[PDB]
Amino acid sequence: KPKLLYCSNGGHFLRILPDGTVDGTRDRSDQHIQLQLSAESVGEVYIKSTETGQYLAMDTDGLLYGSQTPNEECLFLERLEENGYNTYISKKHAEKNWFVGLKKNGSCKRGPRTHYGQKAILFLPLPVS
Numbered sequence: 001k002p003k004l005l006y007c008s009n010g011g012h013f014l015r016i017l018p019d020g021t022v023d024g025t026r027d028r029s030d031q032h033i034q035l036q037l038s039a040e041s042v043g044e045v046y047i048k049s050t051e052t053g054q055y056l057a058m059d060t061d062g063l064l065y066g067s068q069t070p071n072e073e074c075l076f077l078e079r080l081e082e083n084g085y086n087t088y089i090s091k092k093h094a095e096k097n098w099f100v101g102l103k104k105n106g107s108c109k110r111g112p113r114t115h116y117g118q119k120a121i122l123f124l125p126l127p128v129s
Helices: 091-096
Strands: 003-007 012-016 022-025 035-039 044-049 055-058 064-067 076-080 086-090 123-127
Touching (some): 003 035, 076 091, 086 091
Antiparallel strands (some): 003 123, 012 022, 035 044
């Protein structure tokens, strides 16, 4: 049911740390990379941490974070791209085209700094098992 969100940019797996922070990691054994995606409406998804129960979210600053409670900031519009990768846009900031993204160093690429045509936004869901 859960998957790993592999960031093509730097090859990191999306990670939601116990401290509420979100970043990228190359460590396949990391306990914080197993995410369960759940669709609310069609094309709409929640990305929860199986380890902590936290929901992936995007703040008004465009920074990703681990949310203890699902919420409006927790919704993402998933998009299956032509090149084979998926994309996730902040539903709450769609109009601005704010994506989920990771820098080559595995750090979060703020929503505002994101842009289509970027690698940082390309993700690949992979089986955990």
